[PDB]
Symmetry: T
Subunit: 68 residues, 12 copies
């Protein structure tokens, strides 16, 4: 049937988790076609000094491969 | 000794992660009694042209069983 | 020594598990060279009116990098 | 907005892995509506004179809940 | 062939690990038929003035489904 | 080289996931120096009449040790 | 009560997952007594010109120990 | 929002599993305040001529931090 | 240095967890020398009908290998 | 903010763990830009007459994506 | 009877894996008494012009508590 | 096809990680035939006055069964 590929990215943002997810996906869309789903693997981040500096979300992005 | 049961749900939301959890809990409250705690097992979601179509949070909800 | 890369693919088929793995490997052959091994990570699928609709096998495929 | 539930079943069969999965899904269909997807968690089995006696596939079945 | 279902329960007891498991099974057998096996997934508990307040054992209980 | 330590904290908040993480970091920074990074290990919470009562985020906080 | 041992084998076959499991179990039968159950731990394999070369199934075989 | 800390201990006992947990909690109570919950991570132990020399239970203890 | 081997056993008992652990170890001692430690992997069991029939503890037993 | 990608490589060497890591990283440097960190995922190897033949280290290499 | 505590450290070094472990243990010795054993949890690192810049080994250090 | 067995060993050495792996493999050679691969599962060790006392590497060793 169809075949998909998964790439692992890390999105970062000062805004929050959804924004860091959206950041990776926005960059993914520049170079990968047929983006279909994602799976969060890790949530981490840096500290300083209003608390969280940046949120870092490690995620797999899954996309459909074309025929050839 | 009190006994609890855990049911696994996946809440979804186009808005965010809290909203997805809340969606699941709102539905669980309709058919399950004595809801006490939840544990998130997975965060995933779907992608469209806008980016995230929906956030999906897989979680277990634990509740106390009667008698 | 030699250096390998692993790509993660999801093969799908209505027929069964091996055919799902085979579907991923046939596509991988078109763009990847020196395919050597694979490792299954997840077996999942969709459900239709007759039972399984498609099997989906998530696998890592390992191949030698040139140079 | 949408909420799914997951139940954990063990399908068994003497015929093979796919058959064991089909067995769980067939029995699932009798009492669960909107069956959407499955996830295989464990493949195990019993052993007899002729090798495999029964294949046992532990899977989660996900299905959409009504509001 | 036969089809089984697993339900996840948490038994509790102020006495010990076995007693907590038995509490869960004793309750299970009031609403579930054909109980066959259990599998412990987690041991946790709460803490009081005297050490352990209650033991909490998270377990899966497996039972045959009737062909309904 | 440098040596870091990780401590496991659980932040809580009635507001959301980021707020819970910030609660833990805000407390961490009162007794720990040189906070560098955090890693989320679990998200759980409690349930009330209105859905989520409080969100509880389990996280590791990593900080450099002073060569003492 | 009674005591069981588990050994970890890897069965291989060009002819699929069930075939590889059966290969392991046939060999286990030759030198092990009181074979009772198996648990699949990994599925992997090698790749050749036609896709899968060999399927390799890593499993635990459980057997009762005599007293 | 209240904040908790988790410390990892290994309690040991020649008697049994509960006793090992209790050993750890008794010691934790000496230097940690507001002890609330524990989670067992590992059960292991040592072996002598008698069989089990000591049971060892690795656990996290969670307690509320002040200010 | 020294080399050890680990075998995986399943001890069973109606008495409880420690007894099922002791059961595997007693049988291990019949055929393996220099038993040194064990690690519990799984706790499961059968049901009927005073609750637990038998407790089943899956464990690795580690023992020192001799030179030759 | 910025976005990173991770690729999974297997470095090999007859000369040890660090050597295998370095082999992977040297190859990564040839076709990947902005290499920042690595995470070891598995250590395995092959066996020959003298013990270890090749050390094989599976690692993730993280690098910043240009915009 | 006996109770141990475990702390999670990250040793770093430019020299290799063993050196990074030794670095954590040396700093551990300054403030912790009765250091008994360690468990490596993660091996990771940073990458520079010459390949590995810093090795980072995340380990748990276990030590015996006084009564 | 061919069938393999995996035995789990713990190699120990004061020198380092490879020497620990080598110690396990040298002993395995005395009693096991057709040793083919190994997989590291855990790296741990003991601590003495100078830092690491012994490294202990837990590994699975895979070998072909005759027949
Ligand atoms: Mn949010
Ligand atoms: Mn098949
Ligand atoms: Mn007991
Ligand atoms: Mn080395
Ligand atoms: Na569950
Ligand atoms: Na911890």
């Amino acid at each position: 049937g169809k075949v998909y590929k998964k790439v692992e990215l890390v999105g970062t943002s000062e805004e929050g988790l959804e924004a860091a997810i959206q950041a990776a996906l926005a960059r993914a869309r520049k170079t990968l076609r047929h983006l279909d789903w994602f799976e969060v693997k890790e949530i981490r981040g840096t500290i300083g000094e209003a608390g969280v500096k940046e949120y870092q979300v490690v995620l797999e992005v899954g996309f459909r491969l074309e025929e050839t």
